[PDB]
Design a protein around this nucleic acid. Structure first.
Ligand SMILES: [Zn+2]
Lengths: 48, 50, 330, 417, 83, 98
DNA sequence: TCCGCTCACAATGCCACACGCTCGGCCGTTATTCGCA
RNA sequence: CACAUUCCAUUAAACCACACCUGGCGUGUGGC
């Protein structure tokens, strides 16, 4: 949940961030691109 | 607008967009102010205290 | 600082209700009270800022008089021949310059004085604009109905007031409805709302006919009297100076069509058009009609009229509070 | 109980009814809550309530049915209609509804709708599958609106001159360009009187924006049709509210194949109110006018058209000019090449006690061949060519003297030969 | 109110039933405006409204709803602690 | 330095320290051991979750105190349930009988 | 084949630094649409 | 028909904070 990883609006270019929020957003986008590899015009390097 | 500024300074409703981001002295600590320093970025005109 | 004083005087909200010389005098008074608050003594000073473009150049009033109390504003007549004063009152000289008209307390008192002055200006403007409609009827929503009086919206910042004594237990009010009347008194020298409109005055109905009855207004008829016990009985007495019209038959309309209209406009009050005569005897006889009167006497030294009625029409002779008589005595 | 009998009745009968019902002191409050409490009492002792009005859908989802006499304003007299009706009957803003309503319990204070009966004077089955307003195909006016009554009164000659200068038809756009002091109020009043006396089948609507209240009350009971007006007494929010109300009512009525006729006065004041009510978009010209601030007024003037499928909409909006400010001037410039029938009323003829002050030289109407016959058009063109070399006041008095003797424009034309 | 917690492996259907949505976009929050994403990292229909008893678009602020999902984006109006 | 009741952190719903300019005091391990060496199960439960963990528990306790109700609510810590749900985020059902 | 014995940690543990509250371009492809029924 | 999500006389609902770094605090890396 987001409350264990709060992104509070901060004064200036500084912005309080965290780490896991990028790790599984990375897994989200990786699943998206592997879906790109899942369904259309896709050779065995895909399944690998 | 500047006309809106001078109107709000005399008439009109409360200040719409302020958030009261003014800094206040922390709780408990007291004292007497003795000096004020101001630093301004180039281009910005200095206020009367500066 | 002069640029800011300009920006202010030219960037006012109500350029019409607040003329330019009014802004000048308001700024002068604000800076005057600021300079008063400056010094620990009490000395009256005007700033006389250049009305068009320039900045201020204050003065110092001294009030030529043989007194000594508050010598800051005291100059004796004998010790005043210097500087070519030679006068008894008006020694407003330039002994004081260097006014500060932009600091915190000065800005606050100037804002306060400006608020007071624009309030006074809008009051004066509304009163001397809507006072022209003093004889005619005024239409407008009610701002708010209080206990002592009710205040009414008439237009753009337009306020009127109707007193409580002129109200009725059956005449009733709440913010939102439009109640009309006649502007009976205007006190532009008062402290607040000064547009006093009443409804219980008799001539009111006269002007009602003036906006309804076509016979009145052209001098062909002459609405002479009006007896108005508000909510009880509102009779009218007219006279025709021409020889081709009738006093009552033309004004009633067509079997109570316009008279009942003005009645339900007044609040459904019973309105009966009486015909007064050149003598008070027939006048009071008709005022207590339809009924019989066995004796009509007039007394000048007592300033009274003895009206002794007969038995047979009491239901119309007295009524409630002797209204059929109460109008005549009124 | 029906609503209109208690709406358009004088407040005195309402006071009598409320006093006879044995209620609280009724005359001490607004007419709105007076009639609200009267309806509540009659529902507590009586049958279902019967209400009616025009529907407005907010951004919230529900709808409010408001009456015509209050200029469609909020209050206790409104009728709350749930979004379930807007999903079932597929309601829209400006739908003229009339039907059964119930009293409110705790949590509510407005009379909730029970069952609709008449939607825009039509059956819900017929109104279900219909045609949208903007989906219609505009066209030019074909049926000319006869403004001459035929009696030839002292003032109807004005209307006659109008027929002489601007043939009005179902679907035309009329712009009355007249400075103040010029006498357009009684002109519009006579126009409404004539168009209701000659064409009583088509609905007639007038709109007084930023107008004096006395004129509102004297017009709301002198001419036919609901006289909706938003006087200057209220802010511009109510003005844009009533503008949307009347425009959606007209759109729904013309979608139901009804000839709608709108009389709007004045359009410059309405556009100024629009300019101050809609948020600014940054770009500002001289006179304190915004770019998008004229978009909604423009739309309002463009809604009028001649529908090919059924019915039409004819708007007649007057533009107040010659006031000193720049708002009215830029508005009249933006609306100059907008309406297809201008009518200029110069104050030079009005101040000379010569009414109607009509600038016949600068007035005209496009595509008048589709409104008048052949010889009528030929006579009109001959009269125009004859009057054009003349000035304004002289031509006006000549026309007045030539029209006072005759009673009909046809005899006038044949006698002018 | 309980006793003897248990630790073992997992199950997919329980994760699905305990999850109140499916995140699909890597963006956490908009950079221009501070509004959370529709189905990104900082979501609303998966966790809850960012403010107490306030809808995401604001049209369902009323407490009478207390669970009515929005029609534009979709939020169950409740307290922030639910998130 | 003393604190009755003030703001809490954003990452955690616990009182802050000296940098908050109003925070309280830190409860480490040694005094936890010293307290459990004594009795005071109720006192330790209060010091642990009613004053630091249960965001609703502290509010309810303040409400009970301001009307004279000097009684405590059990109020199992919410952060306990959060760590249980995290363990499930790797995985196990967290079953509660009684 | 069986038994015993150091290296990277793991780590009470702090510390330091970077800042905040392997590198580059590009290649590719995509999924990209904020419709309210 | 029908669900029904209402423009909200005293007043409970509109409350609140984000900085200087070897000791105002933590994340990443490295160390045994
Ligand atoms: Zn929403």
């Amino acid at each position: 949940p987001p409350d264990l990883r709060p992104l509070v609006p901060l004064d200036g270019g500084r912005f309080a961030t965290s780490d896991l929020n990028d790790l599984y957003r990375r897994v989200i986008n990786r699943n998206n691109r592997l879906k790109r590899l899942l369904d259309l015009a896709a050779p065995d390097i895909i399944v690998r | 607008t500047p006309e809106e500024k001078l109107l709000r300074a005399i008439f009109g409703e409360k200040a719409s967009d302020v958030k009261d981001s003014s800094l206040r002295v922390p709780n408990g600590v007291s004292g007497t102010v003795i000096d004020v320093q101001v630093f301004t970025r180039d281009g910005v005109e200095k206020d009367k205290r500066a | 600082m002069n640029k800011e004083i300009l920006a202010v005087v030219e960037a006012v909200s109500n350029e019409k209700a607040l003329p330019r010389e009014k802004i000048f005098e308001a700024l002068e008074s604000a800076l005057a009270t600021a300079t008063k608050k400056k010094y620990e003594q009490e000395i009256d000073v005007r700033v006389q800022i250049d009305r068009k473009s320039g900045d201020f150049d204050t003065f110092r009033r001294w009030l030529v008089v043989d007194e000594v109390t508050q010598p800051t504003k005291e100059i004796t007549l004998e010790a005043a021949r210097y500087e070519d004063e030679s006068l008894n009152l008006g020694d407003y000289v330039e002994d004081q310059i260097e006014s500060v008209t932009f600091d915190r307390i000065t800005t606050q008192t100037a804002k306060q004085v400006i608020v007071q002055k624009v309030r006074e200006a809008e009051r004066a403007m509304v009163v001397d604009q809507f006072r022209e409609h003093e004889g005619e009827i005024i239409t407008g929503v009610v701002k708010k109905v209080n206990r002592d009086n009710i205040s009414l919206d008439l237009g753009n910042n337009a306020e009127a007031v109707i007193l409580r004594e002129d109200m009725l237990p059956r005449e009733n009010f709440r913010p939102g409805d439009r109640v009309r009347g006649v502007l009976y008194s205007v006190r532009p020298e008062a402290r607040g709302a000064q547009l006093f409109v009443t409804r219980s005055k008799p001539e009111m109905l006269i002007e009602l006919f003036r906006i309804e009855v076509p016979e009145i207004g052209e001098e062909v008829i002459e609405i002479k009297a009006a007896a108005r016990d508000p909510g009880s009985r509102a009779k009218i007495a007219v006279k025709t100076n021409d020889k081709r019209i009738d006093p009552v038959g033309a004004c009633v309309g067509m079997r109570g069509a316009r008279v009942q209209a003005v009645s339900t406009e007044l609040g459904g009050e019973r309105i009966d058009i009486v015909l007064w005569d050149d003598n008070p005897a027939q006048f009071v006889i008709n005022a207590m009609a339809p009924a019989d009167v066995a004796s009509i006497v007039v007394d000048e030294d007592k300033h009274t009229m003895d009206i002794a009625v007969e038995a047979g029409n009491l239901a119309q002779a007295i009524g409630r509070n002797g209204q059929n008589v109460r109008l005549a005595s009124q | 109980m029906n609503l209109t009998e208690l709406k358009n009745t004088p407040v005195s009968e309402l006071i009598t009814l409320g006093e006879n019902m044995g209620l609280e002191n009724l005359a001490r409050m607004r007419k709105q809550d007076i009639i609200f409490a009267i309806l509540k009492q009659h529902a507590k002792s009586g049958e279902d309530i019967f209400g009616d009005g025009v529907l407005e859908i907010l951004q919230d989802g529900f709808g409010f049915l408001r009456s015509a006499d209050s200029s469609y304003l909020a209050g206790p007299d409104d009728i709350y209609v749930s979004p379930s009706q807007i999903r079932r009957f597929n309601l829209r803003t400006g739908d003229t509804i009339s039907g059964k309503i119930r009293p409110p319990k705790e949590g509510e204070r407005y009379f909730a709708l029970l069952k609709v009966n008449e939607v825009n004077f039509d059956k819900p089955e017929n109104a279900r599958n219909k045609i949208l307003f903007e989906n219609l195909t505009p066209l030019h006016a074909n049926s000319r609106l006869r403004m001459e009554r035929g009696n030839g009164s002292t003032e109807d000659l004005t209307a006659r001159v109008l027929d002489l200068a601007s043939p009005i038809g179902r679907g035309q756009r009329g712009l009355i360009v007249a400075p103040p002091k010029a006498g357009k109020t009684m002109l519009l009043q006579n126009i409404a009187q004539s168009i209701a006396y000659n064409h009583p089948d088509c609905v007639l609507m007038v709109l007084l924006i930023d107008e004096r209240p006395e004129e509102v009350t004297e017009m709301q009971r002198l001419v036919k049709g609901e006289v909706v007006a938003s006087t200057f007494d209220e802010p511009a929010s109510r003005h844009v509210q009533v503008a949307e109300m009347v425009i959606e009512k007209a759109k729904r009525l013309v979608e139901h194949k009804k000839d709608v006729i709108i009389l709007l006065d004045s359009i410059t004041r309405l556009a100024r109110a629009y300019n101050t009510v809609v948020p600014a978009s940054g770009k500002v010209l001289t006179g304190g006018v915004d770019a998008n601030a004229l978009h909604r007024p423009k739309r309002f003037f463009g809604a009028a058209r001649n529908v090919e499928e059924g019915g039409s909409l004819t708007i007649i909006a007057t533009a107040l000019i010659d006031t000193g400010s720049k708002m009215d001037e830029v508005i009249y410039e933006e609306f100059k090449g907008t309406g297809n029938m201008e009518l200029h009323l110069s104050r030079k003829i009005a101040e000379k006690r010569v009414f109607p002050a009509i600038d016949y030289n600068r007035s005209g109407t496009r595509k008048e061949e589709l409104l008048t016959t052949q010889e009528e058009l030929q006579k009109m063109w001959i009269l125009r060519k004859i009057i054009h070399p003349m000035g304004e006041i002289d031509a006006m008095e000549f026309l007045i003297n030539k029209l006072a003797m005759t009673k009909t424009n046809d005899d006038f034309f044949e006698m002018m030969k | 109110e309980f006793d003897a917690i248990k630790i073992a492996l997992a199950s997919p259907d329980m994760i699905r039933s305990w999850s109140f949505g499916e995140v699909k976009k890597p963006e956490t929050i908009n950079y221009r405006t501070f509004k959370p994403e529709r189905d990104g990292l900082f979501c609303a229909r998966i966790f809850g409204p960012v403010k107490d008893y306030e809808c995401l678009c604001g049209k369902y602020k009323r407490l009478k709803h207390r669970g009515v999902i929005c029609e534009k984006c979709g939020v169950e109006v409740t307290q922030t602690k639910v998130r | 330095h003393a604190r009755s009741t003030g703001s809490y952190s954003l990452v955690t719903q616990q009182p802050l320290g000296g940098k908050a300019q109003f925070g309280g005091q830190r409860f480490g391990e040694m005094e936890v051991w010293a307290l459990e060496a004594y009795g005071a199960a109720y006192t330790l439960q209060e010091m642990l979750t009613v004053k630091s963990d249960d965001v609703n528990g502290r509010t309810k306790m303040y409400k009970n105190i301001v009307d004279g109700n000097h009684q405590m609510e059990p109020g199992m810590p919410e952060s306990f349930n959060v760590l249980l749900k995290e363990i499930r985020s790797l995985g196990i059902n967290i079953e509660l009988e009684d």
